[PDB]
Design a protein around this ligand. Sequence first.
Ligand SMILES: Nc1nc2c(ncn2[C@@H]2O[C@H](COP(=O)(O)OP(=O)(O)OP(=O)(O)O)[C@@H](O)[C@H]2O)c(=O)[nH]1
Ligand SMILES: [Mg+2]
Lengths: 138, 205, 517
Amino acid sequence: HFEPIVSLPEVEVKSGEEDEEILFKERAKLYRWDRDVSQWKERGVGDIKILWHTMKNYYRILMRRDQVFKVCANHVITKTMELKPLNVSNNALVWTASDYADGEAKVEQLAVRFKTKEVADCFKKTFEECQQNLMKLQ
Amino acid sequence: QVQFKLVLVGDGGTGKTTFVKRHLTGEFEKKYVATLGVEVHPLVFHTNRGPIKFNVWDTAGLEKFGGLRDGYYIQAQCAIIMFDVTSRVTYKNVPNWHRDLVRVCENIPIVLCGNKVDIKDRKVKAKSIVFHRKKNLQYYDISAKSNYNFEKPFLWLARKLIGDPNLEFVAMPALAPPEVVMDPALAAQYEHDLEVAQTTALPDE
Amino acid sequence: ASEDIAKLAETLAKTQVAGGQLSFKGKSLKLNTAEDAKDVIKEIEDFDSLEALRLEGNTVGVEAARVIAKALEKKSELKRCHWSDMFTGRLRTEIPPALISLGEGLITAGAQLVELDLSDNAFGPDGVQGFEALLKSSACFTLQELKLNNCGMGIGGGKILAAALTECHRKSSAQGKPLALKVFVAGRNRLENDGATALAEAFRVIGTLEEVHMPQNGINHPGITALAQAFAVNPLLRVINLNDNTFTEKGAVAMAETLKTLRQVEVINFGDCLVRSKGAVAIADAIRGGLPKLKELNLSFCEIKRDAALAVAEAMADKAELEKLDLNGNTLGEEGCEQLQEVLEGFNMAKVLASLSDDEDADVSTFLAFPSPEKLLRLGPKSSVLIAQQTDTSDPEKVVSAFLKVSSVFKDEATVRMAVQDAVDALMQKAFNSSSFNSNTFLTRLLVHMGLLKSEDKVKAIANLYGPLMALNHMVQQDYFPKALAPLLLAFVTKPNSALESCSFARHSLLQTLYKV
Ligand SMILES: Nc1nc2c(ncn2[C@@H]2O[C@H](COP(=O)(O)OP(=O)(O)OP(=O)(O)O)[C@@H](O)[C@H]2O)c(=O)[nH]1
Ligand SMILES: [Mg+2]
């Protein structure tokens, strides 16, 4: 029907995961804390993953939205992380992180809710194991 | 870069601002705060042909038609006419919005979006939607709440503008974060937020 | 529709030849600056008696709003202000300021605001906060109509408006002249349940309402029950318009409960309300129980079934002053429509119901044989003499036949006509320069063949005389044509005939040429 207005040649797609190993990948919902209104606002729904690099040897939490495939959470794991269960609700975790999703660092309290409880337990165990591996390197 | 001024038009209370916010932040603004004038929101998508940007002019549906708002439509290249599935009065106005758009911009990809398809008491049905057949439009059911076909309109508009029928979204060009940085001056404040974070429940329905 | 004529009468009642309404409707003025509103303020100042101000279809900025408010400060007789759609294009930082400035101007002026319309302005909670100051103040103790259609208030705006209305009623009662609202039009604002309940509470205080419109508010049954309970108190209700909400079934039952106790309702619009064929039965019972003065009742697109439709029709028929019933869009069978029509015509009306249009359930001889325009061209310049040479000109009959065949393919195309005319000239030049050739015989045969004259042996005539007439017209202007055959052609061309009136232009040109000589 309508004639084209702009022609774009096909380009290669490079996602920063070729040289990293996926130690975890599960469906989840990510919520960001909104201090101005003091209520949780949905940040997205998608596959949250805990990637680990081989040479640089760093652990990175990554997440992409469902259909648009935008990055809704992306940060590094540090010994100062305080992942802990959320008293209200169930099978949910909360932690503060210097998220680098949109355009720059922002200190955000992220709450992740999984489908069931065993998945959340596995995620917490992997998080703790990554923290311990980072700490023991010293 | 590539920019395609998109115009989001529809009756008041249909979900234009909620649609744009769910696209650019992922949240779900369940409060009805009527948009005044026009709001410009850039949405950056990545496709197999590279990155594109849609400058969504979310217009206010409460205003009347006429030339007073033609400033919104000047130099437009794609339009999304949004109507509420659970309200026939809002569907009766789709012809008026289409006429108002084609008055200023004659031939442009126009997508009809039926919003709020997750509610059980549905008034407008797939059989009664006959306007898009008379003209040359693409009709899509969307739901900014449950994320049902909430990116199909943008995909179709990109397909018709770029000119590649087989265009589809690629994952992302996301690279590693620059470096961990913290400011101990405000660090305590951050902790305080967590002390309140655990004291509120997630918006779970 | 009696509503149209009622509105027409109301509009007629408020037209004056002088000292009346001042309007700017349909001017698209962009009052973006104080100076840019110089004409508007100058016109407002130069007005003897002001009793209405329309600013529809304009764009009032903050500075223009302040200037107009300062101008209005003088006008103390103002009683109405239709400000429908006077902020098209302004952002959120410019509407509340302008609205507050206008409210302050009216308050300091000392008006009475019998009517206050703000339809089609994108306000939301911000605009509601903006004009709440005007609504509460003494300028709206006498207010009788408050049209806020399509203001897009929302839940917060609805709550604020309800609080303002309650405070205004309290202050007015304290003064001694309680607020008596008559028409309230708040549609398309998404007052889903909190706003609807707040406004129902506001209505419960005021017992003077007569009309209430809340279409397209996304109200569900939990709020509609409260709205119906609030309506029940008001005994003077006349129009109950709640088009395009969601009553399901509980809402319809609650509405029937109040309709039982109301005895002055005249219009009941419940289109697109999803009554679902049970609330239809409840409403039918309520109206049957007694509800005179009813003029309209709309249940279109309520997904009503056949039996409930028949029940409501039977209940409605007993009404005396019924003037319109709508059931289009309900899932009525094709036989259901016929049954409903039969039931209605069993009564006097028989036509009150609206149309149920939406329901669900070497080659010279070869050319001469069959002459054609293109075949003549192929001969080239040879056609000038080839036709003349081939034709036997001793006998006028063959000359006439050749002339007719040549002229039959005559066309207005420049190349073809010239070839035809030169061929004809050559043929007649060879024909007329023969002692053994009587011209009168040729003319008589030509007239006979064209049908203008009859013959001893009936030779079949030709169909179209355009070509022969054009060829004759050309021939008459040549020298070889005798000056004695002109009268015969003139007499038989002015001679009436059906075959000639078909080609009027050729006949007229030939006659002019003949009268030249
Ligand atoms: N149930 C349901 N409600 C929705 C959905 N999408 C939007 N809504 C509701 O619709 C309302 C739309 O609000 P807004 O988008 O901010 O208003 P708008 O669409 O811009 O309308 P205007 O500002 O007047 O042009 C929201 O308050 C939501 O509660 C949906 O997918 N499902
Ligand atoms: Mg809006």
